[PDB]
Amino acid sequence: AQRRKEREELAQQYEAILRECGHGRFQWTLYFVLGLALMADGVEVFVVGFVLPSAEKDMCLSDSNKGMLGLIVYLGMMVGAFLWGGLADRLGRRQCLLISLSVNSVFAFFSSFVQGYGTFLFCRLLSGVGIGGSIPIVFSYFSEFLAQEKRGEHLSWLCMFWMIGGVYAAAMAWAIIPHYGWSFQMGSAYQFHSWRVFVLVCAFPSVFAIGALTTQPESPRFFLENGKHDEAWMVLKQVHDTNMRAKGHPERVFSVTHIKTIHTWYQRWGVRALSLGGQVWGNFLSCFGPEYRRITLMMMGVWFTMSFSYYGLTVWFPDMIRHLQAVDYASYMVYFVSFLGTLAVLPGNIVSALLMDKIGRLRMLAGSSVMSCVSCFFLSFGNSESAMIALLCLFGGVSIASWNALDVLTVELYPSDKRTTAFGFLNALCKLAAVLGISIFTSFVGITKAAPILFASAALALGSSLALKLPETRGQVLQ
């Protein structure tokens, strides 16, 4: 009773304070700073897929090992998403993002030099664990600096760094891997081929992300929700002063005076760990309370269905391209095709960012899901590699709008004291669906071209149906 009233008052006052601060230099600097973390998350998905064909002959892989290297990144991202999303509600957004990026960068650096298959798999697993928490923490962290006026557009513009990271990965694979002449020996005991240089170069975005992130302040909403008034006041005054100084009005004074707020060594560390686990578990369970159970279940359905369909069909596409190429042949390309498939997403990002607030999150989500379903139904008519590439571009362009709308909706539908926990849980569910869909859609190749299409169409139709029952979030303060 009392706590809900106090949190609603805090939300209203925080909206008023952010409207006083305005949107300007500070928020765009933070946008570009967190774009580096999103870009690292984008690159991680492509690294192993690009390097596997060259690693198979250096580490002597069986096919099952290649598949397990295919699935390790998603497993690690699931675990890391849940872990870091849960922790970010207790330790803070900035600190947990720093720890996540540090783990990711360290183990990505290690994976470039380790020799055996098992150690490389372990290093990639831990790199995925590290970077798994980037999207839940980044989106909430950035949202906690945004007023409601253009919140949807500002959050939608954040999704374009993932595409930029995909482009970076494709370009660097194009530029580095083919050049086998770059290979050398790191001592006479070990040879060091170019794909390891590619693996190393894919770690730079996260290092730059750490460097840029160290300069930014912690989210003031976290401090206010944790009873730390003075720190939140200093952070908000920094925001206001930066915005006004950049706008040519340094004479303005931050008028806020008081903000509502809510309130042996190894043995001590054990107590700390148990208490942190208890609090994270409490947040996770409260995500399923009577106030949010329906929202949580509908979001689980939407996330799982669309992730499963998208990842399964995006793995199915290259397999069909290979099959048609082989059928024709029996009578740079990989990187270039990946680059085209990545650039096919840009129009979707632009349109979704420009229409998110004009037509709302629900219409975006449902219409994009419907278009994805019909573009899936179209895939039965493919007849050539160029046709399959074109349909892949169509599907990828139409689904990224669904993804952006889902991200914004997930940000807006949960309270600040559970936002990262819920986002991490749903993203781990997304990665679990990715694993399951990749496996199932891999099982179908060569046997039929109808079953995976029917699966994806049904899943996307179910997701579109669920997208219409979620509530509107425009015109509401950031709860």
Numbering used by the authors: 139 to 401, 415 to 482, 595 to 742
Task: Reproduce text from the manuscript describing this model.
The synaptic vesicle glycoprotein 2A (SV2A), a member of the major facilitator superfamily (MFS), is a key target for antiseizure medications and a biomarker for synaptic density imaging. SV2A is expressed in nearly all neurons, and mass spectrometry studies show that it is one of the most abundant membrane proteins in synaptic vesicles, with 5–12 copies present in each vesicle, indicating a function relevant to neurotransmission. Although its endogenous substrate and transport function remain elusive, SV2A is a target for clinical antiseizure drugs such as levetiracetam and brivaracetam. The transmembrane core adopts the canonical MFS fold, consisting of 12 transmembrane (TM) helices organized into two six-helix bundles, referred to as the N-domain and C-domain, connected by an intracellular segment that forms a long helix (ICH3).
